[PDB]
RNA sequence: GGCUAUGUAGCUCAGUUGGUUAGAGCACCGCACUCAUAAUGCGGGGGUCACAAGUUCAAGUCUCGUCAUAGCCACCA
RNA sequence: GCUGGCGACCAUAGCAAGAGUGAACCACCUGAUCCCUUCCCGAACUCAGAAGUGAAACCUCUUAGCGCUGAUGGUAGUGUGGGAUUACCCAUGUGAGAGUAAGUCAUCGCCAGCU
RNA sequence: GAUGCAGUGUACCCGCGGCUAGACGGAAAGACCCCGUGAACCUUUACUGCAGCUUGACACUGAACUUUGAUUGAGGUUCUAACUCUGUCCCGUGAUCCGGGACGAGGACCGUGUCUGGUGGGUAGUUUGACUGGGGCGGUCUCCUCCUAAAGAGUAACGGAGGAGUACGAAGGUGCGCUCAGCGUGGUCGGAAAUCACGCGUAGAGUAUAAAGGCAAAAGCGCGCUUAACUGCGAGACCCACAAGUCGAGCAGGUACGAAAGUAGGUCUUAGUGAUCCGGUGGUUCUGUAUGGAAGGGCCAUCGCUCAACGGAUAAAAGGUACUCUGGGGAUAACAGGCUGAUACCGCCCAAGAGUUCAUAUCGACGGCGGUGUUUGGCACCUCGAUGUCGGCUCAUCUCAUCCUGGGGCUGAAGCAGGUCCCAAGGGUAUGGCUGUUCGCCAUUUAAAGAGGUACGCGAGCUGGGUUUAGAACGUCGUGA
RNA sequence: AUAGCACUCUGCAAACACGAAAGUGGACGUAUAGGGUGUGAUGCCUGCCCGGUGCUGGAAGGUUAAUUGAUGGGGUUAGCGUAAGCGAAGCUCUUGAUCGAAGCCCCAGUAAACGGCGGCCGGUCCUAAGGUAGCGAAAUUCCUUGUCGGG
RNA sequence: GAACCCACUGUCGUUGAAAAGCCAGGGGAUGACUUGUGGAUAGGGGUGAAAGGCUAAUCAAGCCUGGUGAUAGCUGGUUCUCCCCGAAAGCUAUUUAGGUAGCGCCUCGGACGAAUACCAUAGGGGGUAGAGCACUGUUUCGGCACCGAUGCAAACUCCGAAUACCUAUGAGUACUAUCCGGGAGACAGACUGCGGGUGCUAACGUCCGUAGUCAAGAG
RNA sequence: UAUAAUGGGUCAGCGACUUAUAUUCAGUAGCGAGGUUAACCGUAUAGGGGAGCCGUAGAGAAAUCGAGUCUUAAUAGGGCG
């Protein structure tokens, strides 16, 4: 079953998204470009524990 | 005992505006599961195949094209 | 959720913190002993030590995670 | 009047068979240098062209051969009022589907080139 | 299920002695059955407390030596002075209570207070769902697709059929590009069916998954680059008790892919879900109980429920009652009545055949049409402020589909007898053994020992053997009641 | 209910019961006694099972409470600082190393303790083990008015 | 086997002579016997050779007085007159099903009037009745999976009405629509005709859609 | 429901929508951008007593602003006014 995780901005603003992933077929950490509204630019978001 | 006895809630599909009526932009014209009708001039299509008006005017139905599709349009 | 302990052939018990440089007893199969048998004696096959990674001249033997199972304890959306 | 492009319309317009056109156009055609291309191939997409041909393909004409369109009349159903209860009948309004007679080898617009 | 309604028959007015067929007669707001988010008592490995029992720490509680484990701990042996004696002696005292005194035996134990873990039907408070052709047992409870559904929407049954409680960083976006399935031919292994080449009619393929509505600008299938599976919104509509749900052009910012006009706010769509409360995590120009901070709270983002009885009564819950009780219901079951007639019983139609030939003397397969209201049933209309009995006894009354007796037709009717059908309801129509029996079997009779209705006639006329209260036992079931 | 039988508990300030306690019964008794439980004169006797639950005896391994409080992380302010920020001590909020009993898990015994004494088609499987003597259509037998004999 | 103590069978009695008896029979009758007087044990307690027995004609928890006017979604009852209007027995949810809440339906006040309805014209979508075999299934007889004749279908469709439904304009007739507030009741329905599911093309059966009547309506 | 469903033998007397406080709506009276006192004092239904309450302004969780305010980077859009 897919697990929930957070994609946290690398700009230090603390902004994040939440999504799911299959840990069997994607063992590595997710990394994707997304829009950060606190700074109003596209930056890289990286996977972290949903906690 | 029986193995039947289930059904789903109604979905209320169908034609909402008939030919010759006036509409304003945004009004929903047809609710449909598939494309029984197709979008003509000044008519838009939603993600669930809903047909809606994108201009003010009068609704018209017709049959057009080489496949004989049913079209709905809005005349200004 | 916390703390412990196990998982070694065909079956079951060892080897347990380095240089492991995995054995023992029964299941078999063949041989020997006997007028014919057994017990016993000999030989062979039968695992690759739950795994995944890490330090290391030495890893089943140690550290990390993941499996399963067993025991005690804790759970006022 | 022939040719090309773009539309209107979507079988009375289509499919199938038979025949015809190289002046121009169109098509087949030559080559793989350069631009570009094939999970291999200049087959397709692309460039440089003019020795050939109207064979193929496309367009045009003929044919009711399949297909398609299709009356009039009757029948089935049916709203209202009445009479009956295997679900029919009367008055009044409405009226198919199938089948028959018959029809069909389309009809228009804009631009450009030729005789 | 009528003294009182309709039609009709009969009937002068009023007592007395008898009788019990009816007045659904009198008596007791049915005890059987169901319901109420009623009661009581009983049980237990239902839930949650408590008494009782027990464990350790601290206190009452002191002095000496010693032994042993990882500076501390645990252990042992002596001592008397706290403390104990339901042991002896003396006094108060004429006293087997009690107090004081002297001894003796124990002794830092036992025992008590506070805290703490275990056990705890001994005792206490409670819970133990609803739908339902009665209730129980079984099944079901939320979402999606089709039919029932009567050509707009909507529409029920314990009606007829199927699916869901997911998947995917590509199976999302964009630019460019491509057509399936089947068959017939030829061609190493290679065939019915692998891969290659060429023709023919064709959407019959595919669309992550069930079905339906769709799918050529393909919504089907490939390749390159990518993150719009964005942030702030949002004119206007659909649907709707509420709470919710659905579609959406367009504006601003940042972005991807295209030469460009442009396309993109997840996937052809419709299932893949859970309110509030209480808390956790990241931010924040809010608040901060004298003031400055802080704790705590607020706002934005997000996490924890098979709360599946899926609008979710608590954080936390099973059973018995024949020892029973109260409020209600003929809204709802068991008896008798009613409606119906599947079943049952009786009658008829056709007639393969059987009967030495011969369908019809007598039987009559395969099929068809009725009648009655006796059986087993279906429904739930009357009665739960009571219509109170399975057989026997006593006493009956009616029907005819006739058991005997009476009158006939036919016969595979010699006579005697029998078989079958028609007419006929005047009278008649067994006693015992077994069992509570109705029934049945048996013995022995008779001209015969008929079939049915009457609240399965008759208990305000009798009984009370059976069933169905309270006692007790066996088999079986349950941990137990 | 009973005489008879058996198991078990109790060493005396007895076990046990009443009571909040003081105290009282047991008993002015002392294991040939007293309490609880089951069976029920007498004759012949009383089979197998300790896997479950209970009771009795062990073990010092795992887990675990109160108490104790080692470390670590925040709040506050002297001071340092242009600033941001840094920041002792003292108070204070929180975290929880070590010590820690019984119980349970583990090992034996016990049925005149509560309980159990098979299933499937000669075998098989599974058990803790698969009914000994005696009796049997019985106060127990559905089928069932079983079958035979007697009356 | 008398007294005395019991209570096995039967008749009678049952508004009794009697709120447990009389009569005729029956059991024990020197013992675990019967009886007088005075004492002890008190309600989740006592006592019981054990029946849930007894504890003042009361016992699966005595009686009396207080909490107390306990609570009851249940049953009953609710008292003078006239005038106007006038329902529902549905949907949704509910430890909900004979209770309740929002909406639908009634009444009163205010605002506002033609925005409403009936009918006639004009515009519009459909997949039912019927029909058919072009798809999906199913059927019969010929010929060589296909061809020719022939049937059937709630979950088949190459087709396809009448009605119903939505919109615009218009004559005539009508106190019509709509909005804002006060007060409700009701959420057990029944039969008949038409279209159906279920049942047996049974039921005064049962469950829906639609119209009429009863409910709440006399002649 | 004539019902064979409930209740009443008859008469006379008694027998069931109340009271206090709060709140909302409708009438009616006074005053009117204002209206009104409570406890209390008081030879006491008068007269004093203005503390307090309702109306006159909204938006936002709040700090804050105010005919505006919240949301937002936004004077755009939108919600409440």
Swiss-Prot record, chain B:
Keywords: Ribonucleoprotein, Ribosomal protein. The keyword Mitochondrion does not apply. Residues 1-12 are annotated as: Disordered. One of its GO terms (biological process) is translation. Pfam families: Ribosomal_L27. It comes from the Bacteria. The keyword Ribosomal protein applies. Belongs to the bacterial ribosomal protein bL27 family. This is Large ribosomal subunit protein bL27.
